[PDB]
Amino acid sequence: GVQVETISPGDGRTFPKRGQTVVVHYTGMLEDGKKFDSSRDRNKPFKFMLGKQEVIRGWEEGVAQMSVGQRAKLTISPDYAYGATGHPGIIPPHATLVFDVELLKLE
Amino acid sequence: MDPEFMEMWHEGLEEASRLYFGERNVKGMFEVLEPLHAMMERGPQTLKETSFNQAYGRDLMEAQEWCRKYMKSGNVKDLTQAWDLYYHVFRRIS
Ligand SMILES: O=C1[C@@H]2CCC[C@H]([C@@H](/C=C/c3ccccc3Cl)CN1Cc1ccccn1)N2S(=O)(=O)c1cc(Cl)cc(Cl)c1
Ligand SMILES: [Ca+2]
Ligand SMILES: [Ca+2]
Ligand SMILES: [Ca+2]
Ligand SMILES: [Ca+2]
Numbered sequence: 364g365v366q367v368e369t370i371s372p373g374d375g376r377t378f379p380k381r382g383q384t385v386v387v388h389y390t391g392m393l394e395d396g397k398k399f400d401s402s403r404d405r406n407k408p409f410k411f412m413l414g415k416q417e418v419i420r421g422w423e424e425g426v427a428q429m430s431v432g433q434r435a436k437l438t439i440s441p442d443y444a445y446g447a448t449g450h451p452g453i454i455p456p457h458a459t460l461v462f463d464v465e466l467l468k469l470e
Numbered sequence: 471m472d473p474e475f476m477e478m479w480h481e482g483l484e485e486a487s488r489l490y491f492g493e494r495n496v497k498g499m500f501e502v503l504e505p506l507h508a509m510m511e512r513g514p515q516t517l518k519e520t521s522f523n524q525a526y527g528r529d530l531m532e533a534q535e536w537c538r539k540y541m542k543s544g545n546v547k548d549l550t551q552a553w554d555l556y557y558h559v560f561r562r563i564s
Contacts, residue, residue, distance in 0.1 A: 399491075405546065407546070410547075417554070448560075448561050448564060450487070450557060451483060451484045451487040451488070451560065452486075452487025452488045452490060452492050453487065
């Protein structure tokens with residue numbers, strides 16, 4: 364599954380709704396701590412539409428639990444990420460992922 | 471599912487992804503994949519080649535389109551779209 368561990372709370376009122384565009388900054392790391400990607404390194408907030416399953420299951424469910432302004436650590440088991448396949452070139456098979464996520468806004 | 475089309479895209483996407491994500495080489499990624507796309511344009515032949523095209527061919531064509539767009543835009547969102555499609559196919563042929 365996915366665990367959300369708050370670093371800094373959001374407003375506690377404004378949560379992602381199906382069909383909204385969710386805007387975040389993130390850093391992704393393997394379970395060992397090696398960074399594989401970060402939106403902050405390219406200074407480009409990452410966007411996705413909630414409910415489209417455009418992102419891994421751990422994001423869909425984890426980020427939906429966050430409110431605007433919140434910063435949190437998402438720990439995502441392989442089955443809620445890239446599973447047995449991994450993603451070639453970047454995510455090995457059976458990888459637990461750890462993300463730092465900041466929910467910037469909803470549009 | 472034509473074994474040879476499956477194999478060439480499996481290995482191709484492994485290489486293209488290593489070059490892009492691992493070696494930060496987007497030109498190298500595009501070079502590996504361009505001849506695989508051109509091979510699809512030549513159109514099916516076997517019953518298995520036709521089956522491959524029906525399952526994956528439109529997704530692959532659209533992935534190339536997103537790459538071509540990246541070539542003019544430089545917007546990684548376009549390249550993400552491409553990988554979404556490539557990965558959708560990769561995962562089913564592996
Ligand atoms: O679900 C994700 C997750 C979570 C939201 C942010 C990105 C997303 C960002 C991808 C991205 C960013 C910049 C350049 C290229 C890419 Cl493909 C990827 N996805 C959906 C997805 C699209 C295409 C292929 C595989 N997975 N990740 S990720 O950090 O696990 C990730 C980053 C990268 Cl550079 C590649 C992959 Cl395969 C996954
Ligand atoms: Ca995905
Ligand atoms: Ca289709
Ligand atoms: Ca489609
Ligand atoms: Ca994107």
